[PDB]
Amino acid sequence: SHENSNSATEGSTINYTTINYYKDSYAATAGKQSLKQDPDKFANPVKDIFTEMAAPLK
Amino acid sequence: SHENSNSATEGSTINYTTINYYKDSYAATAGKQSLKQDPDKFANPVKDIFTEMAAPLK
Amino acid sequence: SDRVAQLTIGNSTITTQEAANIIVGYGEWPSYCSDSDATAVDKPTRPDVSVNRFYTLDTKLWEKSSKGWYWKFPDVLTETGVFGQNAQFHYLYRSGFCIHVQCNASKFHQGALLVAVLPEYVIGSVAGGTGTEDTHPPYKQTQPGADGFELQHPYVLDAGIPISQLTVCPHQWINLRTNNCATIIVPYINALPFDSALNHCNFGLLVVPISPLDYDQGATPVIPITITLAPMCSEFAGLRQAVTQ
Amino acid sequence: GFPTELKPGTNQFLTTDDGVSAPILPNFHPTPCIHIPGEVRNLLELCQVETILEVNNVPTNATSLMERLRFPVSAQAGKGELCAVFRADPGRSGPWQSTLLGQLCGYYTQWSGSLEVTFMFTGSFMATGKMLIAYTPPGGPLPKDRATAMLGTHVIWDFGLQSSVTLVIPWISNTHYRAHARDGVFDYYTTGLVSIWYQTNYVVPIGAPNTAYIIALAAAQKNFTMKLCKDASDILQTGTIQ
Amino acid sequence: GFPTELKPGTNQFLTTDDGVSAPILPNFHPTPCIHIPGEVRNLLELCQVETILEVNNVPTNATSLMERLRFPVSAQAGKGELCAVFRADPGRSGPWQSTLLGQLCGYYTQWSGSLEVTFMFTGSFMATGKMLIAYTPPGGPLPKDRATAMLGTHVIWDFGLQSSVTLVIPWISNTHYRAHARDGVFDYYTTGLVSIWYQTNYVVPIGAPNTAYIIALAAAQKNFTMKLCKDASDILQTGTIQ
Amino acid sequence: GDRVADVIESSIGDSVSRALTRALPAPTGQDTQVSSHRLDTGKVPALQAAEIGASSNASDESMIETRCVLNSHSTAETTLDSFFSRAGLVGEIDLPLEGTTNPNGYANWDIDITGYAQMRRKVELFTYMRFDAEFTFVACTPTGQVVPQLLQYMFVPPGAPEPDSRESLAWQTATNPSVFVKLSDPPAQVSVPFMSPASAYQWFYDGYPTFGEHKQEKDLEYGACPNNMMGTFSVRTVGTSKSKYPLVIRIYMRMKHVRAWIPRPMRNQNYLFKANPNYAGNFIKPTGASRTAITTL
Amino acid sequence: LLQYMFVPPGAPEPDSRESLAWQTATNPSVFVKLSDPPAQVSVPFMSPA
Amino acid sequence: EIGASSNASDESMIETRCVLNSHSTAETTLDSFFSRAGLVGEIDLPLEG
């Protein structure tokens, strides 16, 4: 398997290999991906952060 | 072989791998399975269990 | 020696000391019911032991020409008592059971009864009897009440059900050799987790005399059979006001 | 793909073949497995269930279709006269395949082993009886009297306190399959018989009715095996669902 | 390639199948990924956004299409009379699917869970009020008075300094799917209701106008899930682009 | 704090469905051998009676003895659960050029196992089921020959409107993928997974799948659910080249991924509608033919 | 347009072009046609003895 | 939004309940798999036109 790829799309957490019926390489299964979500800024735009013990509002 | 599966059916006693001609993975041979049977409760619903030496009935 | 029961409520009660033993089920562990898969996410409750106790619902007679009877579960107590109102105003129900049927015969009497509990049974109704002419059965056979209803044909169970092939369910015999009373054990089983108490019908009992009643003339013609039930550790979900809709 | 030449195995109308199948909707999650009773790995596991068997349902009328339990009890002569006989084979059409075990056996060709049988009783306290439960392996004509029962190995039975009578018939089968033929006058292949006898009489005290009729019971053990399913032979449908 | 025989899976008009595709231009480098907002991994992530909901847009005139915000406020009787009611289901056609959450739910068949709601207020300093926010799970007819609100568990609401009123409706759903039927007189399947009530009156001091009408708000939490998309049902196009 | 102990009676240890009984696992098991007649106590498990498993206070076999049998049979691959499929006629349909039963040129059929009760009743012996299915459509001439025509297959997912014309919108079916098949290609072979709304298909079910009070009007939904079903299938000819031969199709059925429960016994009568408990009461006949005597044929 | 139907042992012998034996429920189906290569079917050893 | 209790009590009169989860959200994404059946379009190349 002396062959490399010419793709620059990143964002993989596990190494994996691919094999294609065509001469190219990335046309096979893209692999398994997880799910990520972070809606904090969408509903909570607060700059003044208090300590965990203290109440947020006066 | 950098590829996982998206199936949640359990009940296997030996690890095994699968390869499919389609893009999916579980369409290949399901593997060899044993046979299990337990008809005890069907014909023997007894709660009062005596020791092995003693007779079951008075 | 765990065939005991402590029962006292109202003004009368029935307990046994040397009865015909018990039937065990599935050889299993106690547990509550699944909670983290409902449509909503609100916390459940536990009604505990507030009202669960035995009142007899009917004392069914057995006669010379008995043709068969049954009941609708849990339609027997869905309409009467504080349990009745609770089931009416509450949408989800689940509990275990301990069925104890009282069935005695004297020295004179001979015979046996065919009492079969049939779960999940889609009821074989009259459906016009013949059913070839589209005259739908009235509501007087869907909600009979505390009286139950009379089954038409024994050896087909009104649905084509040959008798010798009823052996799948827990099978019991009523004989003075066998039992002074019979015990039946059934847990809560449904193909779906949650349903209403008015739309879906779970199952019902079935009684058809396996042997004809016989006696030399001069004895009692009919034989009463008593039935009561009290669900153990009942829990109701879908807690809401007294609102049917 | 890499090119090769043609080989047989395609362009044919296939039904028995098990081929890989392509799903339509990727990544679907149905309801998870839920613990419910009634699951069956194999029918042989089901074969060890108590099975009600009614042998002599001789009447053929609708009004008799209410009391098929009956077997003859009356003021018997009580001199070893025959009550009822029935051959050992459970795989023949009739009230024998009426049982679920028999119903499953009716779809099968081969069989390995025999069944286990018993019979109940419903007399009163003082009421009793003295019957005779006897089996004869294949190889003889109809039995005549107690002497034929003597020729047959079985277990002596008596109505005491216990009603059940466990009669086990072992794997009496030399051949697992036979030469292929068709139906005809080939009834020479005997399969055995079971005979029921009275000894003294149907005995009850004065003040007790002289009738007590019960149904039989049977089941299968691990030894018996049953497979090689055949297609349906009898089913009633005047119309088909459109 | 090595020769084999034919198998099913070709020469068929396919649409659902995902097959390997051959590109035309090897080694192409488009513009690189650039960090821009608006990317969505899943609609459920979008479901946790504040969503304006307008319930009682009863008028059906173009000139009313400027003031659909209105809900009835006037010189009320102030004796527990009803303001407005609306059933819990968000997946039915109308002003309910008007919301983006509802618009997405309108394409779906199943649903797991309920929503979260609130309502705002725009009175002056001394101006206040005393309303009643109440939910009833399915299983009852139309509410009558405060007693029906008593039957329904909810949270008591009051116009104090804070205007918002967070009403969360948990996963009140016993079944994940139902028996398949068609539209008709099958309206027996109730889904719940929400009722709005007055207690004393719309109270303002002299010198203050007696009108204050606001719009509602709603959103979805992690518990609710929504999928099984259906095709488009209503779209207007008199001509197609040529 | 911890003062009252009213609630402590609970039995934490949740394992399975609600009950009150209790048991316990064991590490190993027990075995038994065979012997001959002897009067002794302590260890004598040689013979086994399924219910009693001992000897009564009145001897059963005091007069004669027994024998022994040896085993040479294997039961590893005797299971039928999935492999029980064998030969049997299944069914067919037709799409003629000129006809009266098809005035529209297309045929839309509701997909279900209720096709032909003759062989479905064999599978209908159960109520709660999870399985995979397969549909095969083989095309040929009504005479029995083969003709090179132009045909294709469109699938109808559940929830889509039922086509009422040859030009309905249902042909676009945006969310439905496309299968690349032609008469030259092998006939149709489509897998069908388990998309039941509930855990299993509802046939022996007494209920009301529609909301609202139950009346005589809403009674037809028994068996024929307009929306709960998994959809239909529509067949027609697409393109400017219209076929000049009538065609016929044969539909082949096969089941995989068996998983069953709820044993339900055999039926000896006939229905008149889908899952109709009604029966020919005036002509009830037993499951088997009897004889005037049991002794002799 | 031709096709091949198999008759397992024990099935009734067809006496008409429309017999029930065509359904042969327990018999699988082979996907063959005159364009496909001719029939090639393996037969194992199912002797009763 | 608030995540606390106001200086005027919200639920001083009655209590609440709890709900349990049994649903999975691993493969519920639509981003690419949201394609289903639907009519799309056609064109024609006649001989004479």
Side-chain angles (χ1 to χ4, degrees), chain F residues 214-250:
Chain F
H214 62 87
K215 260 88 170 178
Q216 53 293 310
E217 175 194 5
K218 302 310 212 293
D219 299 336
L220 268 181
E221 48 263 19
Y222 282 3
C225 301
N227 48 4
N228 216 28
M229 295 299 291
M230 68 303 296
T232 73
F233 203 91
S234 181
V235 176
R236 76 146 195 168
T237 72
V238 175
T240 187
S241 48
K242 276 73 69 177
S243 176
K244 59 190 77 66
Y245 291 71
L247 190 136
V248 291
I249 299 90
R250 295 182 186 271

mmCIF file of all heavy atoms in Angstrom, chain F residues 214-250:
data_model
loop_
_atom_site.group_PDB
_atom_site.id
_atom_site.type_symbol
_atom_site.label_atom_id
_atom_site.label_comp_id
_atom_site.label_asym_id
_atom_site.label_seq_id
_atom_site.Cartn_x
_atom_site.Cartn_y
_atom_site.Cartn_z
ATOM 1 N N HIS F 214 -65.660 6.544 20.612
ATOM 2 C CA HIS F 214 -65.881 5.436 19.686
ATOM 3 C C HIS F 214 -67.372 5.358 19.376
ATOM 4 O O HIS F 214 -68.206 5.293 20.284
ATOM 5 C CB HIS F 214 -65.355 4.129 20.270
ATOM 6 C CG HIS F 214 -66.034 3.711 21.536
ATOM 7 N ND1 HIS F 214 -67.190 2.961 21.549
ATOM 8 C CD2 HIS F 214 -65.721 3.940 22.834
ATOM 9 C CE1 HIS F 214 -67.559 2.746 22.799
ATOM 10 N NE2 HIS F 214 -66.684 3.330 23.598
ATOM 11 N N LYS F 215 -67.704 5.378 18.091
ATOM 12 C CA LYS F 215 -69.073 5.269 17.610
ATOM 13 C C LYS F 215 -69.139 4.259 16.469
ATOM 14 O O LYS F 215 -68.122 3.717 16.021
ATOM 15 C CB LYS F 215 -69.600 6.638 17.169
ATOM 16 C CG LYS F 215 -70.489 7.325 18.199
ATOM 17 C CD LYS F 215 -69.671 8.158 19.175
ATOM 18 C CE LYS F 215 -70.568 9.040 20.032
ATOM 19 N NZ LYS F 215 -69.788 9.835 21.020
ATOM 20 N N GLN F 216 -70.361 4.003 15.995
ATOM 21 C CA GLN F 216 -70.548 3.070 14.892
ATOM 22 C C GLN F 216 -69.902 3.568 13.609
ATOM 23 O O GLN F 216 -69.553 2.755 12.747
ATOM 24 C CB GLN F 216 -72.037 2.795 14.637
ATOM 25 C CG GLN F 216 -72.940 4.020 14.430
ATOM 26 C CD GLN F 216 -73.092 4.893 15.661
ATOM 27 O OE1 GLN F 216 -73.396 4.406 16.749
ATOM 28 N NE2 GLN F 216 -72.880 6.193 15.493
ATOM 29 N N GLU F 217 -69.742 4.885 13.461
ATOM 30 C CA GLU F 217 -69.103 5.433 12.270
ATOM 31 C C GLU F 217 -67.654 4.973 12.165
ATOM 32 O O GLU F 217 -67.191 4.561 11.096
ATOM 33 C CB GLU F 217 -69.185 6.961 12.290
ATOM 34 C CG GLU F 217 -68.437 7.642 11.153
ATOM 35 C CD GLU F 217 -68.241 9.128 11.389
ATOM 36 O OE1 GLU F 217 -68.612 9.611 12.478
ATOM 37 O OE2 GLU F 217 -67.715 9.812 10.487
ATOM 38 N N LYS F 218 -66.918 5.036 13.275
ATOM 39 C CA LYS F 218 -65.486 4.741 13.271
ATOM 40 C C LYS F 218 -65.255 3.292 13.704
ATOM 41 O O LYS F 218 -64.821 2.994 14.820
ATOM 42 C CB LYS F 218 -64.743 5.725 14.163
ATOM 43 C CG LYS F 218 -64.936 7.176 13.754
ATOM 44 C CD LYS F 218 -64.666 7.372 12.269
ATOM 45 C CE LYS F 218 -64.088 8.750 11.986
ATOM 46 N NZ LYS F 218 -65.078 9.831 12.249
ATOM 47 N N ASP F 219 -65.552 2.377 12.779
ATOM 48 C CA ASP F 219 -65.329 0.953 12.992
ATOM 49 C C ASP F 219 -64.535 0.280 11.881
ATOM 50 O O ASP F 219 -64.091 -0.859 12.074
ATOM 51 C CB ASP F 219 -66.666 0.211 13.150
ATOM 52 C CG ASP F 219 -67.471 0.695 14.340
ATOM 53 O OD1 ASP F 219 -66.874 1.240 15.289
ATOM 54 O OD2 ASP F 219 -68.706 0.517 14.328
ATOM 55 N N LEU F 220 -64.342 0.933 10.734
ATOM 56 C CA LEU F 220 -63.678 0.291 9.605
ATOM 57 C C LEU F 220 -62.166 0.213 9.775
ATOM 58 O O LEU F 220 -61.514 -0.532 9.036
ATOM 59 C CB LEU F 220 -64.012 1.033 8.310
ATOM 60 C CG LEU F 220 -65.216 0.520 7.519
ATOM 61 C CD1 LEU F 220 -65.410 1.334 6.249
ATOM 62 C CD2 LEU F 220 -65.051 -0.956 7.194
ATOM 63 N N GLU F 221 -61.592 0.955 10.726
ATOM 64 C CA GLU F 221 -60.140 1.011 10.860
ATOM 65 C C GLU F 221 -59.531 -0.273 11.409
ATOM 66 O O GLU F 221 -58.315 -0.314 11.623
ATOM 67 C CB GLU F 221 -59.737 2.194 11.745
ATOM 68 C CG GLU F 221 -60.518 2.306 13.042
ATOM 69 C CD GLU F 221 -61.663 3.295 12.945
ATOM 70 O OE1 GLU F 221 -62.076 3.622 11.813
ATOM 71 O OE2 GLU F 221 -62.146 3.750 14.002
ATOM 72 N N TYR F 222 -60.330 -1.312 11.644
ATOM 73 C CA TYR F 222 -59.796 -2.596 12.084
ATOM 74 C C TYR F 222 -59.026 -3.249 10.943
ATOM 75 O O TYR F 222 -59.624 -3.754 9.988
ATOM 76 C CB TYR F 222 -60.921 -3.506 12.571
ATOM 77 C CG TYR F 222 -61.425 -3.191 13.963
ATOM 78 C CD1 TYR F 222 -60.929 -2.108 14.676
ATOM 79 C CD2 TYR F 222 -62.386 -3.989 14.570
ATOM 80 C CE1 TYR F 222 -61.383 -1.823 15.951
ATOM 81 C CE2 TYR F 222 -62.847 -3.712 15.842
ATOM 82 C CZ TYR F 222 -62.342 -2.629 16.528
ATOM 83 O OH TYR F 222 -62.798 -2.350 17.797
ATOM 84 N N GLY F 223 -57.698 -3.238 11.039
ATOM 85 C CA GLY F 223 -56.860 -3.903 10.061
ATOM 86 C C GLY F 223 -56.358 -2.997 8.955
ATOM 87 O O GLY F 223 -55.196 -3.093 8.548
ATOM 88 N N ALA F 224 -57.221 -2.117 8.458
ATOM 89 C CA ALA F 224 -56.884 -1.206 7.366
ATOM 90 C C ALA F 224 -56.656 0.183 7.953
ATOM 91 O O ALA F 224 -57.578 1.003 8.002
ATOM 92 C CB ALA F 224 -57.982 -1.193 6.306
ATOM 93 N N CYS F 225 -55.428 0.448 8.396
ATOM 94 C CA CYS F 225 -55.077 1.742 8.960
ATOM 95 C C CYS F 225 -54.662 2.683 7.842
ATOM 96 O O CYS F 225 -53.700 2.381 7.122
ATOM 97 C CB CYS F 225 -53.950 1.595 9.974
ATOM 98 S SG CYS F 225 -54.336 0.484 11.347
ATOM 99 N N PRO F 226 -55.349 3.807 7.638
ATOM 100 C CA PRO F 226 -54.980 4.689 6.517
ATOM 101 C C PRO F 226 -53.577 5.272 6.614
ATOM 102 O O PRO F 226 -52.926 5.453 5.578
ATOM 103 C CB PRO F 226 -56.050 5.789 6.570
ATOM 104 C CG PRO F 226 -56.604 5.732 7.957
ATOM 105 C CD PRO F 226 -56.509 4.308 8.393
ATOM 106 N N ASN F 227 -53.083 5.562 7.819
ATOM 107 C CA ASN F 227 -51.816 6.273 7.954
ATOM 108 C C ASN F 227 -50.761 5.487 8.719
ATOM 109 O O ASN F 227 -49.564 5.711 8.511
ATOM 110 C CB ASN F 227 -52.038 7.618 8.650
ATOM 111 C CG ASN F 227 -52.886 7.493 9.901
ATOM 112 O OD1 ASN F 227 -53.264 6.392 10.302
ATOM 113 N ND2 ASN F 227 -53.185 8.623 10.528
ATOM 114 N N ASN F 228 -51.177 4.580 9.604
ATOM 115 C CA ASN F 228 -50.218 3.841 10.418
ATOM 116 C C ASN F 228 -49.399 2.866 9.581
ATOM 117 O O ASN F 228 -48.363 2.375 10.041
ATOM 118 C CB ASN F 228 -50.955 3.103 11.540
ATOM 119 C CG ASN F 228 -50.169 3.068 12.837
ATOM 120 O OD1 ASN F 228 -49.368 3.956 13.115
ATOM 121 N ND2 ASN F 228 -50.395 2.029 13.638
ATOM 122 N N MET F 229 -49.829 2.588 8.354
ATOM 123 C CA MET F 229 -49.194 1.569 7.535
ATOM 124 C C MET F 229 -47.855 2.048 6.977
ATOM 125 O O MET F 229 -47.467 3.213 7.105
ATOM 126 C CB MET F 229 -50.114 1.175 6.386
ATOM 127 C CG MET F 229 -51.389 0.493 6.839
ATOM 128 S SD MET F 229 -51.102 -1.042 7.722
ATOM 129 C CE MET F 229 -50.500 -2.056 6.377
ATOM 130 N N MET F 230 -47.149 1.117 6.343
ATOM 131 C CA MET F 230 -45.832 1.364 5.770
ATOM 132 C C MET F 230 -45.868 1.758 4.297
ATOM 133 O O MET F 230 -44.832 1.675 3.628
ATOM 134 C CB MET F 230 -44.948 0.128 5.955
ATOM 135 C CG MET F 230 -45.384 -1.090 5.146
ATOM 136 S SD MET F 230 -47.086 -1.573 5.504
ATOM 137 C CE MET F 230 -46.943 -2.019 7.233
ATOM 138 N N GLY F 231 -47.015 2.183 3.779
ATOM 139 C CA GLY F 231 -47.091 2.682 2.421
ATOM 140 C C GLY F 231 -47.506 1.639 1.404
ATOM 141 O O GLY F 231 -47.711 0.457 1.696
ATOM 142 N N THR F 232 -47.633 2.108 0.169
ATOM 143 C CA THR F 232 -48.064 1.301 -0.964
ATOM 144 C C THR F 232 -46.957 1.275 -2.020
ATOM 145 O O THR F 232 -45.824 1.696 -1.777
ATOM 146 C CB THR F 232 -49.376 1.840 -1.543
ATOM 147 O OG1 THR F 232 -49.120 3.054 -2.257
ATOM 148 C CG2 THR F 232 -50.377 2.121 -0.433
ATOM 149 N N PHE F 233 -47.290 0.751 -3.198
ATOM 150 C CA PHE F 233 -46.372 0.759 -4.329
ATOM 151 C C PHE F 233 -47.155 1.032 -5.604
ATOM 152 O O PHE F 233 -48.185 0.397 -5.847
ATOM 153 C CB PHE F 233 -45.618 -0.570 -4.445
ATOM 154 C CG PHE F 233 -44.325 -0.468 -5.202
ATOM 155 C CD1 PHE F 233 -43.137 -0.194 -4.546
ATOM 156 C CD2 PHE F 233 -44.301 -0.634 -6.576
ATOM 157 C CE1 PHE F 233 -41.949 -0.104 -5.247
ATOM 158 C CE2 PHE F 233 -43.119 -0.540 -7.281
ATOM 159 C CZ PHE F 233 -41.941 -0.274 -6.616
ATOM 160 N N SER F 234 -46.657 1.960 -6.417
ATOM 161 C CA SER F 234 -47.298 2.331 -7.670
ATOM 162 C C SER F 234 -46.402 1.955 -8.842
ATOM 163 O O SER F 234 -45.184 2.161 -8.805
ATOM 164 C CB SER F 234 -47.613 3.831 -7.714
ATOM 165 O OG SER F 234 -48.261 4.176 -8.926
ATOM 166 N N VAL F 235 -47.016 1.400 -9.884
ATOM 167 C CA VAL F 235 -46.307 0.915 -11.060
ATOM 168 C C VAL F 235 -46.955 1.499 -12.307
ATOM 169 O O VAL F 235 -48.183 1.470 -12.451
ATOM 170 C CB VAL F 235 -46.309 -0.628 -11.125
ATOM 171 C CG1 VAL F 235 -45.655 -1.109 -12.410
ATOM 172 C CG2 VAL F 235 -45.610 -1.214 -9.910
ATOM 173 N N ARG F 236 -46.128 2.020 -13.209
ATOM 174 C CA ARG F 236 -46.580 2.546 -14.494
ATOM 175 C C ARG F 236 -45.389 2.553 -15.446
ATOM 176 O O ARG F 236 -44.293 2.096 -15.105
ATOM 177 C CB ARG F 236 -47.190 3.942 -14.351
ATOM 178 C CG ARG F 236 -46.180 5.062 -14.159
ATOM 179 C CD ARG F 236 -46.661 6.340 -14.829
ATOM 180 N NE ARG F 236 -45.590 7.316 -14.982
ATOM 181 C CZ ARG F 236 -45.671 8.406 -15.733
ATOM 182 N NH1 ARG F 236 -46.765 8.693 -16.419
ATOM 183 N NH2 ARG F 236 -44.627 9.228 -15.798
ATOM 184 N N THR F 237 -45.615 3.074 -16.651
ATOM 185 C CA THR F 237 -44.582 3.187 -17.673
ATOM 186 C C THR F 237 -44.240 4.658 -17.877
ATOM 187 O O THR F 237 -45.117 5.465 -18.202
ATOM 188 C CB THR F 237 -45.042 2.561 -18.990
ATOM 189 O OG1 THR F 237 -46.033 3.399 -19.597
ATOM 190 C CG2 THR F 237 -45.634 1.185 -18.744
ATOM 191 N N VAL F 238 -42.967 5.002 -17.684
ATOM 192 C CA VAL F 238 -42.530 6.385 -17.825
ATOM 193 C C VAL F 238 -41.772 6.547 -19.135
ATOM 194 O O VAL F 238 -40.921 5.719 -19.484
ATOM 195 C CB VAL F 238 -41.659 6.796 -16.627
ATOM 196 C CG1 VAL F 238 -41.099 8.198 -16.822
ATOM 197 C CG2 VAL F 238 -42.445 6.695 -15.332
ATOM 198 N N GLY F 239 -42.071 7.612 -19.865
ATOM 199 C CA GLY F 239 -41.325 7.969 -21.054
ATOM 200 C C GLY F 239 -42.210 8.089 -22.283
ATOM 201 O O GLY F 239 -43.361 7.650 -22.316
ATOM 202 N N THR F 240 -41.629 8.705 -23.315
ATOM 203 C CA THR F 240 -42.315 8.911 -24.583
ATOM 204 C C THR F 240 -42.502 7.625 -25.371
ATOM 205 O O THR F 240 -43.381 7.571 -26.239
ATOM 206 C CB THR F 240 -41.549 9.923 -25.440
ATOM 207 O OG1 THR F 240 -42.315 10.242 -26.608
ATOM 208 C CG2 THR F 240 -40.198 9.361 -25.863
ATOM 209 N N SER F 241 -41.708 6.596 -25.095
ATOM 210 C CA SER F 241 -41.832 5.305 -25.759
ATOM 211 C C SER F 241 -42.791 4.444 -24.947
ATOM 212 O O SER F 241 -42.403 3.862 -23.930
ATOM 213 C CB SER F 241 -40.467 4.636 -25.896
ATOM 214 O OG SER F 241 -39.766 4.661 -24.665
ATOM 215 N N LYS F 242 -44.039 4.367 -25.396
ATOM 216 C CA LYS F 242 -45.045 3.561 -24.727
ATOM 217 C C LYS F 242 -44.971 2.114 -25.201
ATOM 218 O O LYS F 242 -44.735 1.828 -26.377
ATOM 219 C CB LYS F 242 -46.447 4.126 -24.966
ATOM 220 C CG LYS F 242 -46.840 5.251 -24.016
ATOM 221 C CD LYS F 242 -46.119 6.550 -24.334
ATOM 222 C CE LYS F 242 -46.600 7.144 -25.644
ATOM 223 N NZ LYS F 242 -45.938 8.448 -25.923
ATOM 224 N N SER F 243 -45.173 1.196 -24.258
ATOM 225 C CA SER F 243 -45.041 -0.222 -24.558
ATOM 226 C C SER F 243 -46.152 -0.686 -25.490
ATOM 227 O O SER F 243 -47.293 -0.222 -25.408
ATOM 228 C CB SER F 243 -45.062 -1.042 -23.268
ATOM 229 O OG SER F 243 -45.018 -2.430 -23.550
ATOM 230 N N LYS F 244 -45.807 -1.614 -26.382
ATOM 231 C CA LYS F 244 -46.785 -2.173 -27.304
ATOM 232 C C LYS F 244 -47.200 -3.590 -26.930
ATOM 233 O O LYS F 244 -47.957 -4.216 -27.681
ATOM 234 C CB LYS F 244 -46.233 -2.142 -28.733
ATOM 235 C CG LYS F 244 -44.939 -2.910 -28.923
ATOM 236 C CD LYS F 244 -44.322 -2.627 -30.283
ATOM 237 C CE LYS F 244 -43.640 -1.268 -30.308
ATOM 238 N NZ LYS F 244 -42.458 -1.223 -29.403
ATOM 239 N N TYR F 245 -46.728 -4.109 -25.791
ATOM 240 C CA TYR F 245 -47.156 -5.405 -25.291
ATOM 241 C C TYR F 245 -47.734 -5.277 -23.886
ATOM 242 O O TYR F 245 -47.187 -4.542 -23.057
ATOM 243 C CB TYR F 245 -46.000 -6.415 -25.256
ATOM 244 C CG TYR F 245 -45.493 -6.860 -26.609
ATOM 245 C CD1 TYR F 245 -44.775 -5.999 -27.425
ATOM 246 C CD2 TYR F 245 -45.727 -8.151 -27.066
ATOM 247 C CE1 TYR F 245 -44.307 -6.409 -28.661
ATOM 248 C CE2 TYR F 245 -45.264 -8.569 -28.299
ATOM 249 C CZ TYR F 245 -44.556 -7.695 -29.092
ATOM 250 O OH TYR F 245 -44.093 -8.108 -30.321
ATOM 251 N N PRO F 246 -48.832 -5.972 -23.592
ATOM 252 C CA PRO F 246 -49.287 -6.072 -22.203
ATOM 253 C C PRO F 246 -48.296 -6.882 -21.381
ATOM 254 O O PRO F 246 -47.537 -7.700 -21.905
ATOM 255 C CB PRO F 246 -50.639 -6.788 -22.314
ATOM 256 C CG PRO F 246 -51.047 -6.638 -23.750
ATOM 257 C CD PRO F 246 -49.769 -6.610 -24.530
ATOM 258 N N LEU F 247 -48.301 -6.645 -20.072
ATOM 259 C CA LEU F 247 -47.285 -7.254 -19.227
ATOM 260 C C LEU F 247 -47.942 -7.838 -17.985
ATOM 261 O O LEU F 247 -49.047 -7.450 -17.602
ATOM 262 C CB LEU F 247 -46.198 -6.233 -18.859
ATOM 263 C CG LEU F 247 -44.918 -6.722 -18.182
ATOM 264 C CD1 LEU F 247 -43.703 -6.053 -18.806
ATOM 265 C CD2 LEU F 247 -44.962 -6.449 -16.697
ATOM 266 N N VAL F 248 -47.259 -8.803 -17.371
ATOM 267 C CA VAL F 248 -47.700 -9.396 -16.119
ATOM 268 C C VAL F 248 -46.511 -9.463 -15.172
ATOM 269 O O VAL F 248 -45.353 -9.543 -15.589
ATOM 270 C CB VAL F 248 -48.318 -10.797 -16.315
ATOM 271 C CG1 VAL F 248 -49.648 -10.693 -17.042
ATOM 272 C CG2 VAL F 248 -47.363 -11.692 -17.077
ATOM 273 N N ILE F 249 -46.817 -9.435 -13.878
ATOM 274 C CA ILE F 249 -45.819 -9.439 -12.821
ATOM 275 C C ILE F 249 -46.163 -10.586 -11.883
ATOM 276 O O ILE F 249 -47.337 -10.921 -11.710
ATOM 277 C CB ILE F 249 -45.794 -8.099 -12.048
ATOM 278 C CG1 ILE F 249 -45.447 -6.931 -12.971
ATOM 279 C CG2 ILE F 249 -44.797 -8.142 -10.899
ATOM 280 C CD1 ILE F 249 -46.661 -6.277 -13.609
ATOM 281 N N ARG F 250 -45.144 -11.199 -11.299
ATOM 282 C CA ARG F 250 -45.320 -12.149 -10.213
ATOM 283 C C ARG F 250 -44.575 -11.629 -8.991
ATOM 284 O O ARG F 250 -43.435 -11.156 -9.102
ATOM 285 C CB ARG F 250 -44.818 -13.544 -10.596
ATOM 286 C CG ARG F 250 -45.604 -14.207 -11.721
ATOM 287 C CD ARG F 250 -45.073 -15.603 -12.016
ATOM 288 N NE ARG F 250 -45.722 -16.212 -13.173
ATOM 289 C CZ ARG F 250 -46.833 -16.934 -13.119
ATOM 290 N NH1 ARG F 250 -47.457 -17.157 -11.974
ATOM 291 N NH2 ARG F 250 -47.330 -17.443 -14.242
#
